[PDB]
Structure formats: structure tokens, C-alpha cells
Design a protein around this ligand. Structure first.
Ligand SMILES: NC(=O)C1=CN([C@@H]2O[C@H](COP(=O)(O)OP(=O)(O)OC[C@H]3O[C@@H](n4cnc5c(N)ncnc54)[C@H](O)[C@@H]3O)[C@@H](O)[C@H]2O)C=CC1
Ligand SMILES: NC(=O)C1=CN([C@@H]2O[C@H](COP(=O)(O)OP(=O)(O)OC[C@H]3O[C@@H](n4cnc5c(N)ncnc54)[C@H](O)[C@@H]3O)[C@@H](O)[C@H]2O)C=CC1
Ligand SMILES: NC(=O)C1=CN([C@@H]2O[C@H](COP(=O)(O)OP(=O)(O)OC[C@H]3O[C@@H](n4cnc5c(N)ncnc54)[C@H](O)[C@@H]3O)[C@@H](O)[C@H]2O)C=CC1
Ligand SMILES: O=c1ccn([C@@H]2O[C@H](COP(=O)(O)OP(=O)(O)O[C@H]3O[C@H](CO)[C@@H](O)[C@H](O)[C@H]3O)[C@@H](O)[C@H]2O)c(=O)[nH]1
Ligand SMILES: O=c1ccn([C@@H]2O[C@H](COP(=O)(O)OP(=O)(O)O[C@H]3O[C@H](CO)[C@@H](O)[C@H](O)[C@H]3O)[C@@H](O)[C@H]2O)c(=O)[nH]1
Ligand SMILES: O=c1ccn([C@@H]2O[C@H](COP(=O)(O)OP(=O)(O)O[C@H]3O[C@H](CO)[C@@H](O)[C@H](O)[C@H]3O)[C@@H](O)[C@H]2O)c(=O)[nH]1
Lengths: 459, 459, 454
């Protein structure tokens, strides 16, 4: 019977923000207050230009901002007034100690939990939205039960997020499903039903799926595991195609017409990237090693190993094709973002293709149309960067007097280039290693030009 | 030109149904299925077909005697037919080099050589049999080594995608038909000619033409992807039992992401059937042939997971019976590898039954459609005489037993009288549900006094 | 056409002697030996050459400025030459993919590209560097791209220290080339150069790959022998047999030969280990792990032999060597050279340095700056002294460690050495140079331990 009147969200990031903006927009009589430790980020949200850009987000925020939606920096009063409290802070991979470089660090989630119980009174619904390790909600509950008061009654729910970077507003206005996890006790289900009620304001009851708490946490990770698996699986197929004279695009199409298999996430590449997949896989493999599930640990670890194989063997072909040495040779790196049409570099296959060539002493010239040059120096640093790396300002400068052109990001502009011009002003034999299949179709015109072309999944 | 006479060498789970469906759809084409096995051809020409397949008996009776024939006269059949299917079995080698891993092609080769010994003029030889990549090239060399004047034999790949239990449905309305052929003129003659046969009931949009190697590899990749889904959901199942999450919940949340799909996410004791294990093992072995050890161990994980799923389940039964099962009666419900078939090939029931037989148990096995003599054959290799009993009905098997092990998801098992089953079971009585069919009946079952444990649910 | 002008890119231990010997034999041919190291070139034009090779000083001074030249000007040497030798180094890559295994072909690639940037008309490019199999296909692809040049293989078989005798009286010459018309003309042209002083029966012609691979295979067999007889020495030590008797016995069987059966602390030198590693790394790419791990045993045994010997010393010195003066007699990798590439002396010294031993190192032909360089990367200032004469090195020494078979180490006065060593005294004979001299040393009071004696 509980009705959720005011909402607070700790963490105004890529998840915290748009999620609450849409809630605000869909349920005009609910107050949505987004707070965050980073005072700048909060300010950019009330600013004309948003901290994170998502198509349609500005329209949504500007619709209810100041009406029922508020961005604020006063976290404490947001919490003590709220009915439901989202925890949407980050869980970065631990950089030291046990689980170094795989395990998730809960220090921020724990900070939200302690600050909540500090400022809370009466009844409240705490809902974690961050990708957490299974039973991380058990920690939030430990903390709350340890620091209890009279009339304090805090209920912990899981409500993970699923939006893809790029389609967030669509993916939230019209979700494939909404996921809510709660205790299978009466205090839980009441809290589950309260969060349902909020999602019912624009999400049909049929797409709202309720589970237990650990099913919901585990669901978040596994969805990413299955997706990343699909890519590693087709990538391994692409290796096999090159050895047997098959074409991986032909094999993809045939596989994906099996409706039980489906056709999404089958485009073989030089490796997947992004701030989410590899992190979640490592998180799950570390969790498994801690629950004495080595069989399961090493099952999922093959998603990473294969993705690491895909990248390393690309670099190997380049060196193997360049007469086994690539030291002091100019090489063009076309594309630095992990996927096209973005400026995000996180875990981009190009960082590692570049780092491999940099270990040989190749003189790299890098071009991305959207990535700032100073970001590329960070991703390659940690200098060896000054001697070998050079961020070019247009593609043709990168290919001038180069041995090879390496395409590492699927930018559509790379499909349009003047490979006539590039060839005259390259060293011979000129090579093209395309690791994003963007040059599919153009293979014949390129050979006759004299270009030597090697692409993933075709001999 | 038109194919007017088809011959299919191999009257098994592929050759029978696929040919019945062609005849039923192509009245003007004479379809003859041949086999070296006379009892089987006898069964085909009888009111009791040699396999149980929903709907197969109507389709056969629909045109048997008119354009559909079953004979042991292989030689005259090859001679008469325009198109010759190769649809013989391709088991894993149980001996020699690659024992336990490599595919055994002795049955393909015998077809190829019989085909050439029986052939004049023009024929299209098509292999449906799942084979290693480059396997048609062998048939092609055998034909080239034994060409006689006017002998023109074209070779095609036409992998089959039906699933047992849904064969007539899959054949009558396939997601796709895949044909692999020479990029040469004679090959395109051959491929167009086979497209014409399927174009009688299969829309041209759903007919995929590729080269021979892509076709064979697609069939392999399709099966690998499917089996991977099962191993992936099963690996999640083990993690569920350790965390308290529920695999049926997690599966559901995962499958509503349309990029993943909701098919083939039903955790089990282990996938069976003639093809998944052997096809993975084939691809893995072939990867070693071609210096691709990374790919080999990426897919090897599919089998290892499945074998761990099975061992872990056997272990629950034994650990929950205090690690001693000697002379304890155990009911085994379901011996078929899936429901709606009589095929037991590689059924998890076999491996589960064998684990319990090694512990000295008294197994009473029931299954609605698997013939009695097949079960005895599958557990022999007597241990069977001392330990194994085939039960006429499920209540007999559960009578005086310590536990019920459900291995096949036949619908009837959910409908049993467990009230009755309990009174005559030894106490404490266990139901180990290896297929999640008793889901939602757990509360009722516990009050009846039954102890129920199922894949992917924390005890 | 008769080859009238020859260029050799790379004036090292191969390009220098091999071209000196070509010039001394062929007075109607102009041989210019070039290199980027200007100090190396200048030393080749000096009364003190940049390498110690017996007979080499005579040969060079007999032609330098008649038909033998050493220049920094790489381009004109190629432009005007009829034949360009590539004799540059192919080390083991210390970086990137295959670090510690694969051969670095960056110096070959440099020649191939400078040749075509600096040459017109007809020229013969010969690969004398020890390359992997099919590396001559790579130079061919380069030349057929930036387009008339022919590519040949002519590996060298000279061993350092005997380079002059081996170049004047070779067992055989190996020339590998294309099986084409254009190729077989270029091969018989190089034969003509060698036929001035090598008989035709001892000139062997094959194809490019068979030649590139014969060089590696030959060095494998050679290195395998040493390791093989070295393994027997450890067998001898445990059964009281004697490695020299066993070796002598083995070698009387004509089918085995009597050569390369001298046990030792471990084979060194620029090539064996890198060539074995090269071939192993070749084998992985070719999906041949048995061949790979077969030849890998040639390296493991070598490393074992050195370690076993280094531990011999530490164990015998009552298990501790910290702050103890030890003499290292012999830093070159073999006798009659000053090359210290992969000398076992480096590996024993580095082992002894890890124990904190103060080393005093002597070698007749190795210059002191090389030893300091070889033993570093300070730890060296603290622990390593370089002695002007041997008796200085052994003054107050706990032990004398012989790592090189310089004939003069017999000639020493171990009466005198023993009087001024700390007690008890030890000699560790890593080359068996002291056989027969034992009883003397035993009576003098020296404790003598060598390779292959219990
Ligand atoms: N990036 C994505 O596409 C998705 C991310 N996620 C989850 O979101 C996490 C990070 O989310 P983002 O919004 O992308 O990152 P973010 O770092 O932009 O957002 C988290 C915000 O929380 C603030 N914060 C951290 N600790 C705090 C504390 N104790 N008190 C107050 N504010 C605090 C941070 O300053 C930051 O602005 C991931 O690790 C994952 O768990 C889930 C789905 C997708
Ligand atoms: N059973 C299935 O679900 C499917 C299997 N496949 C593939 O189709 C092939 C056939 O499989 P099944 O029909 O299940 O096997 P099966 O063993 O039931 O049928 C093969 C038939 O071929 C006959 N045969 C063997 N050698 C012969 C010869 N030299 N001459 C004449 N007849 C001969 C056998 O007696 C047998 O009746 C396999 O390669 C399998 O991988 C493809 C799709 C579905
Ligand atoms: N040392 C030996 O006994 C033999 C060695 N070989 C092979 O012959 C080769 C020559 O080895 P070494 O002479 O001992 O080594 P090295 O290091 O003495 O000679 C290489 C010389 O070439 C110069 N060089 C390298 N790249 C150059 C370039 N691009 N342009 C101009 N000069 C360049 C270097 O400055 C150096 O002085 C090696 O590949 C070796 O494996 C073959 C037979 C015998
Ligand atoms: O066919 C394909 C599709 C994608 N990719 C690669 O996959 C990577 C990841 O792309 P994407 O899925 O957009 O990553 P994210 O933007 O981080 O979003 C993922 O991670 C989020 C956080 O868990 C989930 O909400 C999303 O559903 C999931 O797509 C990229 O580098 C792509 O190049 C391929 O290689 N082939
Ligand atoms: O979610 C699932 C789906 C299946 N299974 C099991 O997996 C096995 C295989 O199931 P299914 O695919 O229906 O069996 P098959 O009849 O062997 O069909 C597969 O193998 C055929 C032979 O290659 C292909 O033609 C089909 O496309 C492919 O589905 C059976 O033991 C099932 O019980 C599960 O455990 N969970
Ligand atoms: O019976 C023996 C023979 C040699 N060695 C050791 O082997 C090493 C190398 O000796 P050697 O073969 O002379 O070395 P190199 O001077 O490098 O010559 C070898 O390596 C050259 C480069 O590949 C080839 O040209 C020669 O044919 C080949 O003998 C030295 O450290 C020696 O002490 C022994 O220990 N015992």
C-alpha cells in the first residue's frame, strides 16, 4: 500500500542521471532529486549543456527540470526526505590487494550505505542500480542492520540498468524489460511493489520482471557475459574461417538465421571494448574463484582469453606480414575509439593494437575524428609515447610514407577515403589490415590499385 | 534442368524425415531412401516407423508408395537418381588416431566410392551429413580420381538444421536452407538445381547460397553456438546454487534482452543427443590440425561444462544419500535425451545412470517412448543384470526407492501422483529434478514430506 | 658477367675477414667494406683492427688500399658495386613478439631498402647473414615491389679464432639461389668469385630455402655435439668415469667423428644459442612443437652445464662466497679471439657476483671496457676488478676459475700462485686445460676440480 512520493539518487553519472530524468518525466507527481559528490557534474546538469550526451536526453531533462526533477549537491537532505533512494555510484575494478585488477571495489557503495543510515529515519527503500557482485546487497544490509535505530526500517532492492551507450532514452522510455529484485519476505515484496508502481507509470506490467535479490544482481552480469560471449565466439569463428577458406560474414548470416540463435552481436571484429564487458567478466570469474567454482570460473574466462587472442593475432599478422620486423616503420592507425561514432576510448581494441606495435618500435601515426589527442596520449602512456607516437590531424597525413594502414575503429568515413592517393604516397608494398570489416566489398578495386589487403575472417 | 529422381543414402533421423517431407511437397519427384540396415528399411515400410517423431507417420503415409520409397537396393537407386544425398552417420572415432575426438568418415567414404562405382552421366551428390570443413573436397578428389567418359558428378553441401522432436515442423517451415557450391559455372548449375527443389515450399528469401566451406562450417558453428548457450546457462545454474539466485529467474531476465533471445536457456543436467558433443569435439580436433589451439580450448569449454554439469548432479544424488547408494533403489524417470523422441544417443540419463551403477545402486528406469531393449543396450559395455530394471510405469519405479531422478522433461512427470509416490518411498525420500519441470510444485512437495533438489536452485 | 666490384654491408666478424680473404685471393676485384659504425670503420683502417682474429692483421694490411677498402659512405659502395653482400647482425629480439627467441631482422630489412634506394641496373644481392628459412623471399618481395636485382644465399661457416684458415680452405661453400634462368646465372657468377681459390667439388649449389636452412641445421648439429658431450660429463662425475676417455672412445668411431667432443663449462659465442632459439621459434609458427622442444634441449643442457658448474664453486667454498676474492682466468668465449659474445665467463661471473663475490678477471685479448660493459646494466664498481696480469688476479684469492682455454693457463707457476692464495685453495677448471697437471697441484695443496671428474 506504500506509495513512493519522493526519490533520491546518489550518483549522477551515465546511469544515475538519465534513469531519474525519465522517472521524473514519466511520473510528474513524484519528486526526483539527483545528488552527487562531484559538485561540477551536478552543476553541468542544471546547465544548458549536459554532462553526458545522449540523443533526446536534453529534451527530457529540460521538460521536468526544476518542476519535479532536481539536480542538487546537498546529498544529506535529499536522503532524509526521500522515500526511495537509488545507489548509482561506480564500482571500479580494484587496483590493488586481493582481486587486484578483477574484483570490484565496493568502497563507494559502502560510503552510500553508511551515509544513508547516518541520515535516515523511519522507513525508506534503498535500491542499488550499479552493477554489483552477487550478494553486494547483502553488504548494504549488514551495514544497515549494524547501525539501526528505533523506527528505522530500510529495505534493500536490486534494480540494475541495461541501457546501451547511445540508445539510453529509447532504452528507458521503452525497455525490453525492467528488473527488480527483493527479499522473498513480506517486507521485501511491499518494497518490490512500491518500485513496480513507479515503473508502471510507463512500462507495461508484463515487461516488469520481479525476482529475488541475488537473481537480479546475477542477471545484470550474465546478460553482459552472454553478449560478450557471442562476440568472442564469432571472433574465434573468424580465425577458423581464415584457415579453411570460409567467409565469416557468410557464416554469421547462416548462424543468425536460426531464430533460437538470433542475428545480433555476430559481427566479427578485432575485439570488443567498452567500460562494461571485460570488467563484468573478470568480476564474475573472481566471484566464482571465491565461491569455489573453478569449473565455472575458467568457462567464462575464455570470453576474455579469446578477446585477447583476437587482438594479439591481429598484431601478429601485421608484424608477420611486414617481413617480421616493424621497427622504425611508419604505420597508420585509423580509429581509436572502442566503437565508431563515439569519443569513448575505454578498453578500445586500438589501445592494445597500438601498444603491441609500440613494443616493436613502430612509428605510429593515429587518427580519430572525434577523440581528443590528449586522451590518446593517456591511453598509451604509463615516455615511450613521445618517440613512437604521433597523433595526426587527418587520415591522409597518417598514411603519407607508411608501410601499412591499420583500421581499428568502424568509422564510416574510413569507407569513403581516397585509396588512390594513399597508395602513391605509401611505401611498397603497401598493406591494409582492416580489423572492422569496413572495407567489405572494396577488395577488388584495392588490389588492382596495388594495395595488399588483409581482413579478419577472410583468407 | 529439373531434378526428378532423388536418392538418399541413409534412412535415419535425417534421411527419413527430410525425404518424406520432400516427397510430400514435390509430387512430381521420385524420392528413394536407401540403407544398408534391412530391419530399419523394413520398419519404414511398416505401420511402426523405426523412430518416434511427432507427425512423421502422417507425412510418410501421405506419399509412401506413390513418390516415396525405402529400399536396401542402394545400387539401383544411385543409378536412377539425379541427386544423391549423403545422410549417413558421422560418429566420433572410438579407436585409432583422434580416438574420442575426431570424426569418423568411414561411412562418408563408403558412400562416395559407392556413388562413383554406380554412376554415369550427370548427378548432383549432396552431403547433408555433418562433416569437418573441407570434407567435400575429399569426395571431389575421389570423383576426380575415378572419372569415366561422360561422368559429371557435382558435389554440394546441404547441412540439416532440424531438431529431433520438432523434425516435421522444422522441415516443413525451416528458418533457412543452406547450400554450398563451387563458385564455378558447373557448381552454380548444381546449386540452382537444388534451390529449385526447396523452392517448392520454402521461400526464396530463406535459401542461403555460399561456397562449400562456408556451408560446412556454418552447420558446425550453429551447433556450437546452441550448445554454448546450454553450457552457459548451466554454468550460471551452478553459481545460482552457491549464491541463492535461481537459474530460471536469471534465464528469464537474460532472455528478454532481444539481442540474446529467450530460446535455449533452460538449464539441465546436461545436453545430449547424437550431435552436439561430437560436433564440438570435431571442430576442436580440426582446430589442432590447423594450429589454432586458442580456438580449440575456447570451444572445449562447452564440453567440459556439460560434463561438469553431469558429474555435479550425480554427486548431489550420491552426497544426499550419505555417499552410499549400494543396493539402494533409485527411480530414473526419463531416458530419452530430450522429450518427444525415442532417441537416447548421448542422453544424460546414460551418464547419470552409469554414475549410479558405479556406486552399486538398484536403478529402476522408466521412459514413455524409449524401447526397453535400447535401455539395456545403452547401459551395457553383467553390471546391468545385477543393477538395472526397466519399469512398465513410473509408480513401479518409485516404489520402495530412495529417490526419484528426473532426467527427461516429458510432460507426464509433472502430472504424477507424488502423494502416492511418497507413501511407498523409503524415508527420507528425495526428488532430484534434472530438468526444472517440478518448478512451482516445491512448496506442495515439501509439505508432502518430499525433499526436492533441482538444478540451479540453492538447497 | 664477371663480378668486378663487391660491396659488403656490415664490417663485423664476417664482413671484415670474408672480404679481406676475397680481396687477397682476387686481385682484379674491388672490395669495399662499409658500415654505419664510424669508429669501427676507422679501426679497420688502423694499425689496431677492431677484432682479434689470428692471421687477420696480415691479410688486411696486404690489401687495404690496393683492392680492400673500409668506408662509412654506404651509398656509393652499393651504387657502383656488382654484388652487395649483406653481413649485418641478426640478434635475438630483446623486445616485442618473440622476445628472447626470434631473430631480429631489422638490420637486414635496413640493407634491403637502402640497396634499392641507391642502385640502378643489374646487381647481385647475397644474404650471408644467418637468416630464417624463406627470408630471401622477403628481400625478393621488396625488390619486386619498388621496381633488376637477384637474391642469393651464401651463408658463412667460418668459426671465430680460425676464420682465416677456414676462409682460405673451406670445407665447402654454399650458394643458394632461384631455380630460374635469371637465378642460375647469378649463382654461377658468385661461383666464379669463389672459384679463384675454392675447388669446384667443394662448391655446393642448392635453392634459397635449402641453403638458409642448411646453415641453421649445421649449427644445431655442432651445438648438439657439445651439449651432448657436456651431458656425458655430468654422467661421468657421478660414476667416476672420465669424460675425456669417453669422448676419445666415442670419437674413434669414424661415423661420429672426433671433433667437437671437448667438454666445457658451456658453449658461447654470438651464434649457436641465438640460432637454436631462432629455429625453435620458427617451429612454433610452423606447428612443429616436437622439433621445437627437441632442439630446445641443446640450450637447456648448456644452461644446466653452466649453472651446475657455478654451483660447483659456491658449494665447495663451504657454501658461501660473499666478500671472497675469486679469480676468473678467461673472459673470451673461446681461445684465440677477443669476442665475448655469450661467453660462459659472463654467466659464471654473474652467478658469482650474485653471491657477493669480489671478482678479479684476466684475459689476454679481451679489452677491459668490454668486460665492464658485459657485466653491467652500480654492482660492478663494488664487486668487479679487472687485472692487468693473472698473478694479480689470484693474489689473496680463495679460488681460481678457468673459463677459457687460452693455452697459457698451463704455463702458470702454481707453486707461486698457491703461496699467495688464501687457504684452503681451489682451482676450478672449466676447460680441462689442466689434465695431467693434477698430481702437481694436489701435492702443492691445491684442491682441483674439473668438468667430468668425480
Ligand atoms: N556505463 C554504463 O553504461 C553502465 C554502468 N552501470 C553501472 O554504473 C557504474 C558506474 O556508472 P556511471 O554512471 O557510468 O559512472 P559515474 O562515475 O559517471 O557515476 C557515478 C557517480 O557517483 C559519484 N559517487 C561515487 N561515490 C559517491 C559517494 N560515496 N557519494 C556520492 N556520489 C558518489 C561519482 O562521483 C560519479 O559522478 C558501473 O560500474 C556499473 O556498476 C550499469 C549499467 C551500464
Ligand atoms: N539426428 C539429428 O538430429 C541430425 C543429424 N545430422 C547429421 O546427419 C547425419 C546422419 O545422422 P542420423 O540420421 O542421426 O544418423 P543415423 O545413424 O540414425 O543414420 C545413418 C544411417 O546411415 C546408414 N548408413 C551408414 N553407412 C551407410 C552406407 N555405407 N550405406 C548405406 N547406409 C549407410 C546407417 O545404417 C543409418 O541407418 C550425421 O552426420 C549428423 O551429424 C544433421 C542434422 C540433424
Ligand atoms: N661471427 C661468426 O662467426 C659468424 C656469424 N654469422 C652470421 O653473420 C652475421 C654477421 O655477424 P657478426 O659480423 O658477427 O656481427 P657484428 O655485430 O660484428 O656485425 C654487424 C655489423 O653490421 C653493422 N650494421 C648493422 N646494420 C647495418 C646497416 N643497416 N647498415 C650498415 N651497417 C650495418 C653493425 O654496425 C655491425 O658493425 C650474423 O647474422 C651472424 O649470425 C655467420 C657465420 C659466422
Ligand atoms: O556485433 C557486434 C556488436 C558489438 N561489438 C563490440 O562490442 C563492444 C561493446 O559494445 P556495446 O554493447 O555497445 O557496449 P556498451 O556500450 O558498454 O553496452 C554494453 O554494456 C552495458 C552495461 O552492462 C549493457 O547495458 C549493454 O546492453 C551492453 O551492450 C564494442 O566495442 C563493439 O565494437 C562487436 O564486436 N560486434
Ligand atoms: O535450453 C535447452 C535446450 C536444449 N537442451 C538439451 O540440449 C540437447 C539438444 O537439444 P536439441 O537442440 O533440441 O536437440 P537435437 O535434436 O540434437 O537438435 C540439435 O542438433 C541437431 C543436429 O545437429 C541440429 O540440427 C539442431 O538444430 C540442434 O538444435 C537435448 O538433450 C536437450 O535436452 C537443454 O538442456 N536446454
Ligand atoms: O668441443 C667443443 C667445441 C666448441 N666448444 C665451445 O663452443 C663455443 C663455440 O665454438 P665455435 O664453434 O668455434 O664458435 P664460433 O666461433 O661461433 O663458430 C661456430 O658458429 C659460427 C657462426 O654460426 C659458424 O660459422 C661456425 O661454423 C661454428 O663452428 C665456444 O665457446 C667453445 O668453447 C666446446 O665447448 N667444445
Amino acid at each position: 500500500m506504500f506509495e513512493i512520493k519522493k526519490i533520491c539518487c546518489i550518483g549522477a553519472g551515465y546511469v544515475g542521471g538519465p534513469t531519474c530524468s525519465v522517472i521524473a518525466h514519466m511520473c510528474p507527481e513524484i519528486r526526483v532529486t539527483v545528488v552527487d559528490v562531484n559538485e561540477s557534474r551536478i552543476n553541468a546538469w542544471n546547465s544548458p549543456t549536459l554532462p553526458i550526451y545522449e540523443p533526446g536526453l536534453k529534451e527530457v531533462v529540460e521538460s521536468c527540470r526544476g518542476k519535479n526533477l532536481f539536480f542538487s549537491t546537498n546529498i544529506d537532505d535529499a536522503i532524509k526526505e526521500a522515500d526511495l533512494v537509488f545507489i548509482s555510484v561506480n564500482t571500479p575494478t580494484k587496483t590493488y590487494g586481493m582481486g587486484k585488477g578483477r574484483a570490484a571495489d565496493l568502497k563507494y557503495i559502502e560510503a552510500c550505505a553508511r551515509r544513508i543510515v547516518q541520515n535516515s529515519n523511519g522507513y525508506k527503500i534503498v535500491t542499488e542500480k550499479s552493477t554489483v557482485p552477487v550478494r553486494a546487497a547483502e553488504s548494504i544490509r549488514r551495514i544497515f542492520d549494524a547501525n539501526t535505530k528505533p523506527n528505522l526500517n530500510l529495505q534493500v532492492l536490486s534494480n540494475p540498468e541495461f541501457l546501451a551507450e547511445g540508445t539510453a532514452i529509447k532504452d528507458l522510455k521503452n525497455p525490453d524489460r525492467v528488473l527488480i529484485g527483493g527479499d522473498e519476505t513480506p517486507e521485501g515484496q511491499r518494497a518490490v511493489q512500491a518500485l513496480c508502481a513507479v515503473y508502471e507509470h510507463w512500462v507495461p506490467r508484463e515487461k516488469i520482471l520481479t525476482t529475488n535479490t541475488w537473481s537480479s544482481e546475477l542477471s545484470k552480469l550474465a546478460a553482459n557475459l552472454f553478449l560478450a560471449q557471442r562476440i568472442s565466439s564469432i571472433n574465434s569463428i573468424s580465425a577458423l574461417c581464415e584457415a579453411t577458406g570460409a567467409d565469416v560474414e557468410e557464416v554469421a548470416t547462416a548462424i543468425g538465421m536460426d531464430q533460437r540463435i538470433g542475428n545480433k552481436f555476430l559481427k566479427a571484429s578485432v575485439g570488443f571494448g567498452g567500460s562494461c564487458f571485460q570488467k563484468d567478466v573478470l568480476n564474475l570469474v573472481y566471484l566464482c574463484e571465491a565461491l569455489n567454482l573453478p569449473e565455472v570460473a575458467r568457462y567464462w574466462q575464455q570470453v576474455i582469453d579469446m578477446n585477447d587472442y583476437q587482438r594479439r593475432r591481429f598484431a601478429s599478422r601485421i608484424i608477420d606480414s611486414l617481413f617480421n620486423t616493424v621497427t622504425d616503420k611508419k604505420i597508420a592507425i585509423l580509429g581509436f575509439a572502442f566503437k565508431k561514432d563515439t569519443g569513448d576510448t575505454r578498453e578500445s581494441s586500438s589501445i592494445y593494437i597500438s601498444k603491441y606495435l609500440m613494443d616493436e618500435g613502430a612509428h605510429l601515426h593515429i587518427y580519430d575524428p572525434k577523440v581528443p589527442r590528449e586522451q590518446i596520449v593517456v591511453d598509451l602512456s604509463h615516455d615511450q609515447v613521445s618517440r613512437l607516437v604521433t597523433i595526426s590531424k587527418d587520415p591522409y597525413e597518417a598514411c603519407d610514407g607508411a608501410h601499412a594502414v591499420v583500421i581499428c575503429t568502424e568509422w564510416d568515413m574510413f569507407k569513403e577515403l581516397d585509396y588512390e592517393r594513399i597508395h602513391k604516397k605509401m611505401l611498397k608494398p603497401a598493406f591494409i589490415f582492416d580489423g572492422r570489416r569496413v572495407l567489405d566489398g572494396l577488395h577488388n578495386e584495392l588490389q588492382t590499385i596495388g594495395f595488399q589487403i588483409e581482413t579478419i575472417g577472410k583468407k
